[PDB]
Amino acid sequence: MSSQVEHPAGGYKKLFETVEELSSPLTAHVTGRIPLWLTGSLLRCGPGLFEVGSEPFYHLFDGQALLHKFDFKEGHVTYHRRFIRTDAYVRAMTEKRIVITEFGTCAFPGVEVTDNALVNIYPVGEDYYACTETNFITKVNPETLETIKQVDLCNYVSVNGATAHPHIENDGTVYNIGNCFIAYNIVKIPPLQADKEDPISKSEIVVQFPCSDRFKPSYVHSFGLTPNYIVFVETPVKINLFKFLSSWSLWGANYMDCFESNETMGVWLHIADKKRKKYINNKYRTSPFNLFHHINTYEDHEFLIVDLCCWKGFEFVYNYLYLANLRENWEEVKKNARKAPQPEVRRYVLPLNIDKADTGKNLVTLPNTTATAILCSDETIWLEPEVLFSGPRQAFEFPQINYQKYGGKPYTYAYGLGLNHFVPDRLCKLNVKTKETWVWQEPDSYPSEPIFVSHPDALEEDDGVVLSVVVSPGAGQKPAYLLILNAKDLSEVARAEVEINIPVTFHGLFKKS
Amino acid sequence: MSSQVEHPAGGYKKLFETVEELSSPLTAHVTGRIPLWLTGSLLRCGPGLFEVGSEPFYHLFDGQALLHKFDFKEGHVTYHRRFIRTDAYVRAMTEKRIVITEFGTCAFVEVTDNALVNIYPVGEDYYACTETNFITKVNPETLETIKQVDLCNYVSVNGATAHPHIENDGTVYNIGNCFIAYNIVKIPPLQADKEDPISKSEIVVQFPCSDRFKPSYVHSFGLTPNYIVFVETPVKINLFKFLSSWSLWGANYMDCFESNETMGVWLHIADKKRKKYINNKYRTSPFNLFHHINTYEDHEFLIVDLCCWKGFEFVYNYLYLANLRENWEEVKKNARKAPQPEVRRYVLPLNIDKADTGKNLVTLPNTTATAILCSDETIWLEPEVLFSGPRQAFEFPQINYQKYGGKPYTYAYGLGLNHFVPDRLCKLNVKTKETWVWQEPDSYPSEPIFVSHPDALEEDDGVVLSVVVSPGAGQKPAYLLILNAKDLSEVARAEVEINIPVTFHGLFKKS
Ligand SMILES: CCCC(CCC)COc1cccc([C@H](O)CCN)c1
Ligand SMILES: CCCC(CCC)COc1cccc([C@H](O)CCN)c1
Ligand SMILES: CCCCCCCCCCCCCCCC(=O)O
Ligand SMILES: CCCCCCCCCCCCCCCC(=O)O
Ligand SMILES: [Fe+2]
Ligand SMILES: [Fe+2]
Ligand code: NA
Ligand code: NA
């Protein structure tokens, strides 16, 4: 973990304030020691333009995509940023107004889907793509930050969109999930082959998950992956297709206007056989929650361990993320969040071998968990979680692990961004076996998602650092900095200060050079 | 909290072995220093006779009630025990066989009065109880049995729990099934006329049943200055089996239980002072519940701290003596598919505004518990988990009851169960989730009972007392353990030269 800080000075407002791009990189001023083995680029995406002239964007996810880069070489750091030349951005700059409808901001005058790639960036073959959650992803140059092209996934595969959280196997194979308007489809993009053709042209749907409601598919943000299984969590946050596919020009609608909460379904969990490409018909059921981020998933004897960042309730958490709410003063921010769903890290355990003879009993026979799974007579398997972390309006969010070596596998550690009534104000580490936590936090300092980078000679799982971008608007300080923490105990190793503001960023990666 | 010990020697079997009563008290041999302010009697109940001749009792809750007493005076300790002369026991001794049907043992009809579970004060009297209509008046100084009391002669219930709440003026509240509702009984304090307060018993409020024909098993309930809290679980009593003739079919109490798979848990509150059921449909996931820890009011909310078991299967299925007497690897294996124990805090909003439909009503600043108002007006609850360990139950909870019962509090003491075997003592800070453990190898404790220093201003300024069975051959068979309530460090122990079997509940009676 929890925060030990209040924010009466309101400095978190700087996260949602427009900035200018740069012509070329700035030097970041180092204190402490940047590790000499740290060579490459921290790439991250966020909104950077929160109004076009006098027309405001209303939601956290509406501001125009800004691509950020911190470069590390021989103990020195540079910072650079460029707006992504999406259709949304280019047309806004041409017409000097909001032209494309964003997540929570209707544009005044069917109509074009946004390609505002403000959320994440990921590798496909030798390319990098910035994304949001629509059918449009934007190819970008990781060295110059130039925009290369728009890619419409609809030209290649049968999905209406895909999440900003594809899984990436160590050979470069990419898996993602997307709505299909009815199913949820797993897309597979293979590694780059000898022929050097673009791997997106070899995309395919490999398996399909069914929908609980013919006309109302669930919002999906992420999914789990193990060597043998795919895990999909179907939440009660629904997309109303009667509103989504109606004409938005007539009604004046945006994406937020299409969400509704199903009160009675709870959460349905789904698994598929990855290698045999087959949906498994196990009716896993539990209580209602929102889910954005899976932490990690793995196999342990005949069971799937599913670690999740949950929000307890069926109301859509995105309702609390209009910019007007996030720009309020601190007492009002806390008050507004009182009735929101509560964040909680939970471990669910999914049995793979269901024996009818155990009807009415707990199938989770593993020795090291308090998670349960009850086989009912109607063949639903009712799940209860083991709670790994819980604090009052203190979210362990934007989870990251040592992904390259422990993604999809037995693991011990997760790193997170700590939210305090939705305001990011600390960095966290969680031992998922012991429930021990570590916190890093300074007054009036607003961090981003921490990204893990392994030491080249790592023996343990947490032999490395985490990198986070911190906004520090206190007038006795430079506006922002890159923070490097030792992954062992979250003690500070270095920081690299820059003389300009940085707004909120969501996700990213470290690209080794 | 969790245990750090395995039990391959099987010493826990001594908890379920018959013992002989005593003719008069033994001296318990003290090591360390019994506090000189500790003056009175630890009274506790458990089974003590696990077979009548060659006829065995089958279930944990079948053996014949044994009343135990440790006396504390000027740093000296005595131990004494007597079988309760119930109808079940007396008739068994007369007829040299099992005459009355017990919880899980059919006799080859009359309701059992085997008062093996607890003891509590009414007026100037003490009553040993089980969970039926029969409670047994007993003498707290001599351990003699005085009389049988049939609650049905006084109030409209079929039984009452072994966990009545006791207000500081001596008023007693309890809950019992009525065969259809759950009735709260109130027994007033002793008046000037000196008449027996049981004759002034009354039903003050009634909770509805979720199923006309299948009432829930009820073990305990919550009480605050202003409210009564009742948790209706999916463990049901099948009245078609309960009220059928058991002589023909050969049935016991265990044979009447079934689990409702779809209802989950329904939580109920009543206005205590206005004697009125409140129509708030609190709903959550399925669990068994035996013991409320404590209940209190905080702004417009009820804080409900519970020892839960995650699942709808009846936990009592895992407590046949044959299972509990298995070797350690088999005990662990048998418990793998049982419900998981978990301490949970639920938060019940009292002011429900329809304008908040679809939102979380729990606006308190210090909890992660939630309560969602649905369109059908059910309020769906999620807990804050306070303690969770794999088959490691924080159970038999106790608090500083006299000063913090029904009120804001910080500390609970518990007996730690390891795949159902009691092997440690625990303390839980319910605000910080910090835990403390006391544990020795091959040592099987009982429920810890808290005794305040008489002049304490703080909540945990006192000791806990537990009766520990220690069958290791380098030790006396049992002892009374005294721990400092601050940190569970040992203050003293009082060893006795005879075995003591399992005990369930009890009290400390100040003299
Ligand atoms: C009706 C919903 C539709 C759903 C995709 C439908 C294929 C998602 O749509 C969008 C649109 C714009 C922005 C975003 C952001 O990525 C959300 C925050 N990460 C998602
Ligand atoms: C069908 C259930 C009936 C129910 C009472 C219904 C008036 C409870 O009956 C009994 C009978 C005998 C022993 C016990 C033990 O106290 C249980 C463990 N504490 C309860
Ligand atoms: C650094 C962000 C701070 C302000 C917003 C925090 C509220 C986050 C709520 C949970 C995560 C929602 C998903 C956002 C990340 C994403 O778009 O992938
Ligand atoms: C000291 C007891 C150890 C062996 C039995 C432990 C199993 C306990 C399961 C939860 C509590 C069950 C109710 C027992 C207390 C009572 O009868 O009032
Ligand atoms: Fe995300
Ligand atoms: Fe009990
Ligand atoms: Na600090
Ligand atoms: Na010890």
Question: Distance between CA atoms of B65 and B52, rounded to whole angstroms?
Answer: 13
- Asked whether the beta carbons of A485 and A453 are under 8 A apart, the reply is no
Question: Taking a C-beta distance cutoff of 8 angstroms, is the pair B76, B34 a contact?
Answer: yes
Of A287, A358, A360, the CB nearest to B285: A287
The Cα A309–Cα A225 span in angstroms is 16
B438–chain A nearest CA distance, Å: 20
In sign, the C-alpha dihedral spanning A423, A428, A432, A435 is negative
Distances in Å between the alpha carbon of A157 and those of A179, A180, A189, A215, A241? 12, 10, 10, 21, 20
Residue (of A304, A410, A288) closest to A364 by Cα position: A304
Nearest partner of B376 among B359, B357, B391, B396, judged by Cα? B357
Residue with tokens 């923490």: A485
Task: Give the span between the Cα atoms of B11 and A383, in whole angstroms.
Answer: 35
d(CA A353, CA A356): 10
Method: X-ray
Q: Residue B117: helix, strand or coil by DSSP?
A: coil
Task: State how far the Cα of A368 lies from the Cα of B2, in Å rounded to an integer.
Answer: 12
| Cβ density class B173-193: b for 16+ within 10 Å, e for less | bbbbbbeebbbbbbbbebeee
CA A196 to centroid of ligand 7, rounded, Å: 50
- Return d(Cα A458, Cα A451) in angstroms, integer: 16
Query: ∠ at Cα A302 (A299, A308), nearest 5°?
Result: 45
Residue nearest to ligand 3 atom 15, measured at CA: A506
Sign of the alpha-carbon torsion through B8, B12, B16, B22: positive
Strand partners, B429: B411
Question: Relative to the alpha carbon of B114, which ligand is closest?
Answer: 2
Cβ contacts of A370 on chain B, cutoff 8 Å:
310, 340-342, 388-390
String of DSSP letters for A252-281: T--SGGGEEE-SS--EEEEEEETTTTEEEE
Q: Is B249 helix (H, G, I), strand (E, B) or coil?
A: helix
Tokens 């079940």 belong to B88
Q: Are B377 and B355 in contact (CB under 8 A)?
A: no
Which stretches of chain B sit within 8 Å of chain A by CB?
259, 261-262, 284-286, 310-313, 336-342, 356, 358-363, 365-370, 372, 374-376, 380, 382, 384-385, 388-390
Q: How far is the CA of A508 from the centre of ligand 5 (A)?
A: 10
Say how far apart CA A258 and CA A244 lie, in whole Å: 6
Interchain proximity B360–A315, CB inside 8 Å: yes
Query: Which one of A60, A103, A290, A325 would you pick to mutate in the ligand 3 pocket, going by the greatest count of ligand atoms within 8 A of its CB?
Result: A60
Strand pairing partners for A55?
A52
Beta bridge partners of B389: none
Closest ligand 2 atom to B62 CA: 13
- State whether residue A334 is helix, strand or coil: helix
**Alpha helices, DSSP H, located in A200-307:** 241-244, 248-251
- Which residue in the set B259, B285, B360 is minimally distant from A342, CB to CB? B360
Contact (CB, 8 A) for B8 and B423:
no
Data resolution in angstroms = 2.2
| Known binding positions of B | 163, 219, 291, 505
Is A52 strand, coil or helix? strand
Measured between CA atoms, the residue of chain B closest to residue A363 is B337
A339 and B363 Cβ atoms separated by less than 8 Å:
yes
| B188 backbone dihedrals φ, ψ, rounded to 5° | -80, 165
Helix (H) or strand (E) holding A323: helix A323-326
Q: Which of B17, B307, B420, B426 to mutate to test the pocket of ligand 4 (most atoms within 8 A of CB)?
A: B420
Q: Cα–Cα distance between B504 and A209 in angstroms, integer? A: 51
Give the containing element (helix H, strand E) for A333: helix A330-337
> Rounded to the nearest whole angstrom, what is the distance from the C-alpha of residue A426 to the centroid of ligand 7?
9
**How many Å apart are CA A379 and CA B440, to the nearest integer?**
44
CA distance B440 to B472: 11
Q: What is the residue-wise DSSP string for B356-387?
A: GTTSB----TT---EEEE-TTSEEEEEPEEEE
Listed in sequence order, the residues at least 6 apart from A27 whose beta carbon sits closer than 8 Å to its beta carbon are: A76, A77, A78
From the list A412, A467, A388, A487, the residue with the least C-alpha distance to A79 is: A467
Beta strands B276-284 and B378-382, pairing class? parallel
User: Residue A175 CA to chain centroid, in angstroms?
Assistant: 15
Side chain identity at residue B45, one-letter code: C
Q: Are A281 and A272 in contact (CB under 8 A)?
A: no
**Which among B495, B463, B500 is positioned nearest to B30, based on CA atoms?**
B495
